[PDB]
Write an enzyme that holds these catalytic residues in place. Structure first.
Site, PDB file in Angstrom:
ATOM      1  N   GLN A  19       0.808  -1.211   0.000  1.00  0.00           N
ATOM      2  CA  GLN A  19       0.000   0.000   0.000  1.00  0.00           C
ATOM      3  C   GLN A  19       0.842   1.261   0.000  1.00  0.00           C
ATOM      4  O   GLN A  19       0.315   2.327  -0.314  1.00  0.00           O
ATOM      5  CB  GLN A  19      -0.934   0.006   1.208  1.00  0.00           C
ATOM      6  CG  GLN A  19      -0.207  -0.050   2.538  1.00  0.00           C
ATOM      7  CD  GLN A  19      -1.162  -0.052   3.700  1.00  0.00           C
ATOM      8  OE1 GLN A  19      -1.543  -1.106   4.186  1.00  0.00           O
ATOM      9  NE2 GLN A  19      -1.540   1.130   4.169  1.00  0.00           N
ATOM     10  N   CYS A  25      -5.133   0.458   3.631  1.00  0.00           N
ATOM     11  CA  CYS A  25      -5.203  -0.944   4.047  1.00  0.00           C
ATOM     12  C   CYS A  25      -6.582  -1.538   3.797  1.00  0.00           C
ATOM     13  O   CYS A  25      -6.704  -2.685   3.337  1.00  0.00           O
ATOM     14  CB  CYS A  25      -4.843  -1.047   5.532  1.00  0.00           C
ATOM     15  SG  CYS A  25      -6.021  -0.158   6.578  1.00  0.00           S
ATOM     16  N   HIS A 163      -6.194  -1.388  11.345  1.00  0.00           N
ATOM     17  CA  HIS A 163      -5.499  -1.918  10.174  1.00  0.00           C
ATOM     18  C   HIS A 163      -6.312  -3.065   9.591  1.00  0.00           C
ATOM     19  O   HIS A 163      -6.556  -4.070  10.265  1.00  0.00           O
ATOM     20  CB  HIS A 163      -4.096  -2.387  10.572  1.00  0.00           C
ATOM     21  CG  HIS A 163      -3.250  -2.860   9.430  1.00  0.00           C
ATOM     22  ND1 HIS A 163      -3.237  -2.242   8.197  1.00  0.00           N
ATOM     23  CD2 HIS A 163      -2.385  -3.896   9.338  1.00  0.00           C
ATOM     24  CE1 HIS A 163      -2.399  -2.875   7.398  1.00  0.00           C
ATOM     25  NE2 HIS A 163      -1.864  -3.880   8.068  1.00  0.00           N
ATOM     26  N   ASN A 187      -0.750  -9.410   4.813  1.00  0.00           N
ATOM     27  CA  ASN A 187      -0.629  -7.973   4.997  1.00  0.00           C
ATOM     28  C   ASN A 187      -0.452  -7.297   3.633  1.00  0.00           C
ATOM     29  O   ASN A 187      -0.367  -7.946   2.584  1.00  0.00           O
ATOM     30  CB  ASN A 187       0.537  -7.666   5.950  1.00  0.00           C
ATOM     31  CG  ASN A 187       0.438  -6.281   6.611  1.00  0.00           C
ATOM     32  OD1 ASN A 187      -0.498  -5.520   6.368  1.00  0.00           O
ATOM     33  ND2 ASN A 187       1.431  -5.955   7.452  1.00  0.00           N
TER      34      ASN A 187
HETATM   35  C1  VLF Z   1      -5.833   7.243  12.395  1.00  0.00           C
HETATM   36  C2  VLF Z   1      -6.386   6.239  11.419  1.00  0.00           C
HETATM   37  C3  VLF Z   1      -6.201   6.393  10.051  1.00  0.00           C
HETATM   38  C4  VLF Z   1      -6.686   5.468   9.143  1.00  0.00           C
HETATM   39  C5  VLF Z   1      -7.372   4.356   9.611  1.00  0.00           C
HETATM   40  S1  VLF Z   1      -7.968   3.155   8.466  1.00  0.00           S
HETATM   41  O1  VLF Z   1      -9.283   3.546   8.054  1.00  0.00           O
HETATM   42  O2  VLF Z   1      -6.952   2.946   7.480  1.00  0.00           O
HETATM   43  N1  VLF Z   1      -8.160   1.755   9.243  1.00  0.00           N
HETATM   44  C6  VLF Z   1      -9.508   1.209   9.414  1.00  0.00           C
HETATM   45  C7  VLF Z   1      -9.447  -0.305   9.683  1.00  0.00           C
HETATM   46  C8  VLF Z   1     -10.770  -0.906  10.084  1.00  0.00           C
HETATM   47  C9  VLF Z   1     -11.188  -0.882  11.409  1.00  0.00           C
HETATM   48  C10 VLF Z   1     -12.395  -1.451  11.780  1.00  0.00           C
HETATM   49  C11 VLF Z   1     -13.199  -2.052  10.834  1.00  0.00           C
HETATM   50  C12 VLF Z   1     -12.795  -2.084   9.515  1.00  0.00           C
HETATM   51  C13 VLF Z   1     -11.589  -1.514   9.141  1.00  0.00           C
HETATM   52  C14 VLF Z   1     -10.237   1.981  10.508  1.00  0.00           C
HETATM   53  O3  VLF Z   1      -9.790   2.078  11.631  1.00  0.00           O
HETATM   54  C15 VLF Z   1     -11.532   2.641  10.143  1.00  0.00           C
HETATM   55  O4  VLF Z   1     -11.988   3.693  10.975  1.00  0.00           O
HETATM   56  C16 VLF Z   1      -7.573   4.175  10.971  1.00  0.00           C
HETATM   57  C17 VLF Z   1      -7.080   5.116  11.858  1.00  0.00           C
HETATM   58  C1  TQ8 Z   2      -4.822   0.633   7.615  1.00  0.00           C
HETATM   59  C2  TQ8 Z   2      -3.966   1.736   7.067  1.00  0.00           C
HETATM   60  O1  TQ8 Z   2      -3.988   2.024   5.889  1.00  0.00           O
HETATM   61  C3  TQ8 Z   2      -3.068   2.477   8.034  1.00  0.00           C
HETATM   62  C4  TQ8 Z   2      -3.641   3.862   8.364  1.00  0.00           C
HETATM   63  C5  TQ8 Z   2      -3.112   4.399   9.670  1.00  0.00           C
HETATM   64  C6  TQ8 Z   2      -3.442   3.787  10.872  1.00  0.00           C
HETATM   65  C7  TQ8 Z   2      -2.932   4.259  12.070  1.00  0.00           C
HETATM   66  C8  TQ8 Z   2      -2.084   5.346  12.083  1.00  0.00           C
HETATM   67  C9  TQ8 Z   2      -1.751   5.967  10.897  1.00  0.00           C
HETATM   68  C10 TQ8 Z   2      -2.261   5.497   9.697  1.00  0.00           C
HETATM   69  N1  TQ8 Z   2      -1.749   2.588   7.417  1.00  0.00           N
HETATM   70  S1  TQ8 Z   2      -0.564   1.552   7.786  1.00  0.00           S
HETATM   71  O2  TQ8 Z   2       0.633   2.041   7.170  1.00  0.00           O
HETATM   72  O3  TQ8 Z   2      -1.052   0.245   7.451  1.00  0.00           O
HETATM   73  C11 TQ8 Z   2      -0.354   1.635   9.531  1.00  0.00           C
HETATM   74  C12 TQ8 Z   2       0.361   2.685  10.084  1.00  0.00           C
HETATM   75  C13 TQ8 Z   2       0.421   2.814  11.459  1.00  0.00           C
HETATM   76  C14 TQ8 Z   2      -0.215   1.908  12.296  1.00  0.00           C
HETATM   77  C15 TQ8 Z   2      -0.159   2.069  13.796  1.00  0.00           C
HETATM   78  C16 TQ8 Z   2      -0.910   0.857  11.721  1.00  0.00           C
HETATM   79  C17 TQ8 Z   2      -0.982   0.709  10.346  1.00  0.00           C
END
Ligand code: VLF
Ligand code: TQ8
Length: 220
Positions: A19, A25, A163, A187
């Site tokens: 990604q 993700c 994630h 992943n």
């Molecule tokens: C600060 C932050 C930035 C991006 C994301 S994310 O959207 O990439 N990760 C998803 C993963 C997820 C969680 C629960 C159910 C389905 C998918 C989320 O947590 C959605 O709210 C989360 C946090």
């Molecule tokens: C699921 C995803 O795309 C995450 C988004 C995210 C989640 C938490 C904090 C910043 C950004 N990107 S990720 O690179 O997979 C990732 C980065 C940091 C954490 C703690 C988890 C996942």
């Protein structure tokens, strides 16, 4: 259920993707689940476009590189009548305007199924359906440096997952602690991370990292 499942052996799973520095993700989890169900239907494995989801599934509630949900992506493929192939709509790791072209769509779904928040229910779905989209708490240094074995993080949350990833199977191996069961998880951080891009996550250890709290798959 079987003691061991690995859908990669049945042809359901594309190679590990990356990604990059985009918070997409959720899109890679969703394409992984849809890639499996499409194969289950047609016998043809076709890599699907995460960029198509990142650029286009905003009306379903997704926010591109700022986050999203696998269910919203499944809802988009249904609402939209299709999803373009990876080759036709390649991944750029940045959000742009929607460039969906139905001539190049290779997948469809008619909804999604949300799995009860129980590892027992997740096991049965993995054993009978195919790869399953799940969300986990990946917010720990231990996850970043995972290399082998069964991943277990005592500080892992079962309620706040950040994630989205893909369960492609489950299994067991003897360990020092006799916590031997794992989920086999694809992943989206490329194949240099973990075990060729995969992680064995602790299974039946009280919903470790929340792997069973937001599991789902698309209806194909
Ligand atoms: C600060 C932050 C930035 C991006 C994301 S994310 O959207 O990439 N990760 C998803 C993963 C997820 C969680 C629960 C159910 C389905 C998918 C989320 O947590 C959605 O709210 C989360 C946090
Ligand atoms: C699921 C995803 O795309 C995450 C988004 C995210 C989640 C938490 C904090 C910043 C950004 N990107 S990720 O690179 O997979 C990732 C980065 C940091 C954490 C703690 C988890 C996942």
């Amino acid at each position: 259920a079987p003691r061991s499942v690995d859908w990669r052996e049945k042809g359901y799973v594309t190679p590990v993707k990356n990604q990059g520095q985009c918070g997409s993700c959720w899109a890679f989890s969703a394409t992984g689940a849809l890639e499996g169900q499409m194969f289950r239907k047609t016998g043809r494995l076709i890599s699907l476009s995460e960029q198509n989801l990142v650029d286009c599934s905003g009306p379903q509630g997704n926010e591109g590189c700022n986050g999203g949900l696998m269910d919203y992506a499944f809802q988009y493929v249904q609402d939209n009548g299709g999803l373009d192939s990876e080759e036709s709509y390649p991944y750029e790791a940045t959000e742009e305007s929607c460039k969906y072209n139905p001539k190049y769509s290779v997948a469809n779904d008619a909804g999604f199924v949300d799995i009860p928040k129980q590892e027992k229910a997740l096991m049965k779905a993995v054993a009978t359906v195919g790869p399953i989209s799940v969300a986990i708490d990946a917010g720990h240094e231990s996850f970043l440096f995972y290399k082998e074995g069964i991943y277990f993080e005592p500080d892992c949350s079962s309620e706040d997952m950040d994630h989205g990833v893909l369960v492609v199977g489950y299994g067991f191996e003897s360990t020092e602690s006799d916590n031997n069961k794992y989920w086999l998880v694809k992943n989206s951080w490329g194949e240099e991370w973990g075990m060729g891009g995969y992680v064995k996550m602790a299974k039946d250890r009280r919903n470790h990292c929340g792997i069973a709290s937001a599991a789902s798959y698309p209806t194909v």
